[PDB]
Design an enzyme around this catalytic site. Structure first.
Site, PDB file in Angstrom:
ATOM      1  N   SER A 133      41.140  46.400  40.566  1.00 27.22           N
ATOM      2  CA  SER A 133      40.341  48.173  39.743  1.00 27.22           C
ATOM      3  C   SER A 133      40.637  47.247  38.825  1.00 27.22           C
ATOM      4  O   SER A 133      40.181  46.873  37.764  1.00 27.22           O
ATOM      5  CB  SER A 133      41.409  48.915  40.588  1.00 27.22           C
ATOM      6  OG  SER A 133      41.443  49.959  40.505  1.00 27.22           O
ATOM      7  N   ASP A 194      32.921  51.595  48.570  1.00 26.71           N
ATOM      8  CA  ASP A 194      33.940  51.638  47.399  1.00 26.71           C
ATOM      9  C   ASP A 194      33.731  52.331  46.014  1.00 26.71           C
ATOM     10  O   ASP A 194      32.370  51.946  45.842  1.00 26.71           O
ATOM     11  CB  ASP A 194      34.648  50.540  46.600  1.00 26.71           C
ATOM     12  CG  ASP A 194      35.914  49.999  45.425  1.00 26.71           C
ATOM     13  OD1 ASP A 194      35.634  50.900  44.801  1.00 26.71           O
ATOM     14  OD2 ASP A 194      36.029  49.057  45.109  1.00 26.71           O
ATOM     15  N   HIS A 247      38.060  51.283  48.214  1.00 27.00           N
ATOM     16  CA  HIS A 247      38.652  50.644  47.060  1.00 27.00           C
ATOM     17  C   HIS A 247      40.067  50.461  47.240  1.00 27.00           C
ATOM     18  O   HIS A 247      40.445  49.276  46.350  1.00 27.00           O
ATOM     19  CB  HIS A 247      38.836  51.974  46.149  1.00 27.00           C
ATOM     20  CG  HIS A 247      38.730  51.418  44.744  1.00 27.00           C
ATOM     21  ND1 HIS A 247      38.052  50.059  44.096  1.00 27.00           N
ATOM     22  CD2 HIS A 247      40.587  51.437  43.565  1.00 27.00           C
ATOM     23  CE1 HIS A 247      39.170  49.460  42.851  1.00 27.00           C
ATOM     24  NE2 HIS A 247      40.215  50.746  42.800  1.00 27.00           N
TER      25      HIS A 247
END
Length: 260
Positions: A133, A194, A247
């Site tokens: 991320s 995601d 995610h």
């Protein structure tokens, strides 16, 4: 183009780097005992957290960044202002995600100094950079910078945002031999739908680099696709919105869970 399936050796590498990335949210919990944990990378103002590590059994020095673990980090994540990548001015016309740039600037001196020491000590080791991320974009900016000085930089990212403009992506594609999956040293790992690899939107002047390794469930070497080129396909075709379950959970490992 796309193909389905990767080698178990490659798959296992992706899983290992995903483990370290997801452990970075909880002080590197339950990582292999053969990884030597080095200095903590930290800036209080940006709350960027990471570590330098070494694995003598795989002959790599690993720099890992934590993704978002605070509202301070969330301020960085959500600043989409393109910013000249002025720490690496040989990257002509390169601009990067403004929030991650502020992150990078805050820890650059510490990262560069730690890597320089370790790389000089272990000159034959790969310089691997990784994260999830926000940590994935921090890894990208870091790897870009390192690649101008060192020839053995490797980049594994998980749920990476579009980290910069096409100039930046093209620079990284050149540096990391991305033109073939056979040569690539940049493994841009995505999972199912995601949402984060769709942000910031391409229409805001952003582009991905790297070879995309698209993990579809149930996750396995056989169920990871290799996606090349700049057309919409793989994770970016799935319509995922923002932070979603896909995610947070890569190869079954949820950020900070410590159940691996």
């Amino acid at each position: 183009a796309s193909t389905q399936g990767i080698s178990e050796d490659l798959y296992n590498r992706l899983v290992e780097m995903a483990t370290i990335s997801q452990a970075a949210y909880a002080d590197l919990c339950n990582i292999p005992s053969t990884i030597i944990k080095g200095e903590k990378i930290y800036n209080a103002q940006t709350d960027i957290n990471g570590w330098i590590l070494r694995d003598d059994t795989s002959k790599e020095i690993i720099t890992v960044f934590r993704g978002t673990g605070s509202d301070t980090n969330l301020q960085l994540d959500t600043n989409y202002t393109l910013t000249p990548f002025d720490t690496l001015p040989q990257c002509n016309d390169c601009e990067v995600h403004g929030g991650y740039y502020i992150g990078w600037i805050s820890v650059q001196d510490q990262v560069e100094s730690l890597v320089k020491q370790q790389a000089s000590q272990y000159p034959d080791y790969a310089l691997t950079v990784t994260g999830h991320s926000l940590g994935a974009s921090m890894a990208a900016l870091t790897a870009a910078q390192l690649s101008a000085t060192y020839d053995n930089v490797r980049l594994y990212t998980f749920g990476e945002p579009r980290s910069g403009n096409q100039a930046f992506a093209s620079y990284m594609n050149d540096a990391f031999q991305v033109s073939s999956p056979e040569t690539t040293q940049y493994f841009r790992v995505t999972h199912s739908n995601d949402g984060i690899p769709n942000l910031p939107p391409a229409e805001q002047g952003y582009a991905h680099g790297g070879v995309e390794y698209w993990s579809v469930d149930p996750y396995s070497a056989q169920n990871t696709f290799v996606c090349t080129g700049d057309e919409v396909q793989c994770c970016e075709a799935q319509g995922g919105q923002g932070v979603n379950d896909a995610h947070t959970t890569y190869f079954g490992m949820t950020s900070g869970a410590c159940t691996w």
